[PDB]
Amino acid sequence: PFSFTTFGKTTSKFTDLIYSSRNPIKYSLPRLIYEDLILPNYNNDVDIANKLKNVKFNIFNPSTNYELCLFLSKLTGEPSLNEFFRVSTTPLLKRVIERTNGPKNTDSLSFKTITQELLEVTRNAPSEGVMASLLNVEKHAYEREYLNCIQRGY
């Protein structure tokens, strides 16, 4: 592909290689916008209002909304009552990365759906089994079409 990049080019023991690709389009912002509207400042109110909207008036805060947290801990079955406040105030992809959770209360309203039972069966299962081969057909289509050796077209 055409490298739409500006970078460190040579005009002509080791020679170190450092990633330096940049977009030639440069968007210029004044310092006034950044230092007045985005960063905290003594005459700014961004940190104060941000805390007041994210922590003080959060409905998942257990200090002031313990009944709702206990309600949702009955429903979901979380072992920790601060899981709801932590989940509501994390970036979603960071929530994806930090998701690995195995203990759950058995006296909860979270359920194991038939599809989830079948997924737990085909987490690890070999061939010649009916209950796994009826659900692993994407890999069967990948294997029978000789699709790991098709050349790139685009």
Partner: protein
């Protein structure tokens, strides 16, 4: 304490006797004795909870009290019973179909009851002595939990060590631990430990140290609707979807599994089904698809009692081209029992206006009450009820406490009703913008 005075704030419930016989004026409801008795019969078959999926329709002219009787039924129903009052305009959504919107309303109006047994240990942590296992399995701990009254030392397993390390807890942090279920919380930092640290944390919260006994026992009753279980069991982290509203057309297998295991939960007795009332206000503002789904969706055992209100006469049904009684198809009126309301005479208007004056703290004189009664029977009840408050403000601007006839006359002069506005625009049609987009803006031709 957040709630203010509304148009329907005076109503505290149906004014019934023990024999389902309405008093002339009780609990803010005046007149409508046959309608209130029918609503009381509906209330009793709700409270019995043995009949599923009845449709009852409330019909009457405008400013009669169909909405008033519905929210009176809601007030007499009490808390811990689900009540869903939606308009017909809330059905039409972009990312959810209309049929799924009615299914969400139906399963939002029916719920189950769940009992808790809590043994909570709420106290400020003094010290967390860790007994480090050599192999690392089954780590032991010596928690120093302490309220204002007493202190003792507890024995901790490995997973509670993991819980107290996966959320950071230190000395002086107020927590509560349940013995039976093992639930861990972190209420914050005790107020006695506020001056140790000169600048607070981003997440650090200050809570009072608890009083009295360390270990407390309490039972809690929880009422969860079936729609909340539908939302929770649909997604991995589905409790956010209870609040953002992004549910996204929950499939039928999930609802079928939830229904069958709520049924066997009732069989083993952990839960008890609490039926409720769904109030579809302005049901004439619905498509024929909504009416057909309402007809076929009332024949399930997990269907609430549907109350609908209509002020429409023999008009067309939306989505078709033919006129039908009440703006509803004859299939819906087949599976319906109609509560019919009737207009009021001058005495019922006088008593309702007196009630709404006593609700908004407005002190009405007798002559002003009679003048408001005449304006109510001439134009409408709601115009007079809205005139009361502005008459109060006019009187207060005149440095007076009570309202006289002059404040009501000035309030009648400054603000116009529908009929005077209609005559005042029919007299001068040149100044207003017509249906054909023609207007005369020049004041002199």
């Amino acid at each position: 304490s957040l709630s203010l005075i509304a148009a329907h704030s005076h109503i505290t419930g149906l004014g019934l006797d023990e024999n389902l016989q309405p008093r002339p004026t009780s609990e803010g409801m005046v007149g409508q004795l046959q309608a209130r008795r029918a609503a009381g019969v509906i209330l009793k078959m709700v409270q019995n909870g043995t009949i599923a999926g009845r449709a009852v329709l409330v019909a009457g002219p405008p400013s009669t009290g169909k909405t008033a009787l519905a929210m009176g039924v809601s007030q007499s129903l009490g808390k811990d019973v689900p009540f869903t009052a939606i308009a017909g305009s809330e059905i039409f959504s972009l990312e959810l179909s209309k049929t799924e919107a009615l299914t969400q309303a139906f399963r939002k109006s029916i719920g189950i009851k769940i009992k808790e047994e809590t043994e909570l240990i709420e106290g400020e942590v003094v010290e967390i002595q860790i007994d480090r296992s050599i192999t690392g399995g089954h780590k032991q701990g010596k928690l120093t939990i302490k309220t204002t009254d007493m202190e003792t030392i507890y024995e901790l397993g490995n997973k509670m060590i993991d819980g107290l390390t996966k959320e950071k807890v230190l000395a002086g942090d107020v927590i509560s631990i349940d013995k039976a279920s093992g639930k861990i919380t972190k209420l914050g930092r005790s107020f006695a430990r506020s001056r140790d640290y000169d600048a607070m944390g981003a997440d650090t919260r200050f809570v009072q140290c608890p009083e009295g006994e360390l270990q407390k026992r309490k039972t809690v009753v929880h009422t969860v609707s079936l729609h909340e279980i539908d939302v929770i069991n649909s997604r991995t982290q589905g409790f956010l979807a209870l609040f953002t509203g992004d549910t996204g057309e929950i499939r039928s297998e999930v609802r079928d599994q939830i229904n069958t295991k709520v049924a066997e939960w009732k069989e083993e007795g952990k839960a008890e089904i609490v039926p409720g009332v769904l109030f579809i206000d302005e049901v004439h503002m619905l498509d024929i698809e909504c009416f057909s789904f309402i007809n076929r969706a009332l024949e399930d055992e997990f269907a609430p009692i549907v109350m609908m209100a209509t002020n429409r006469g023999v008009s067309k049904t939306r989505g078709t081209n033919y006129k039908s009684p009440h703006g509803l198809p004859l299939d819906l009126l087949d599976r319906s029992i109609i509560i019919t309301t009737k207009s009021y005479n001058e005495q019922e208007i006088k008593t309702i206006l007196s009630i709404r004056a006593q609700e908004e703290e407005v002190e009405l004189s007798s002559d002003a009450l009679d003048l408001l009664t005449k304006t109510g029977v001439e134009t409408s009840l709601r115009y007079s009820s809205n005139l009361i408050s502005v008459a109060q403000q006019i009187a207060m601007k005149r440095k007076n406490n009570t309202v006289e006839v002059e404040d009501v006359k000035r309030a009648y002069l400054l603000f116009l009703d529908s009929a005077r506005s209609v005559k005042y625009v029919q007299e001068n049609e040149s100044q207003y913008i017509d249906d054909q987009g023609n207007v005369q803006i020049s004041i002199a031709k």
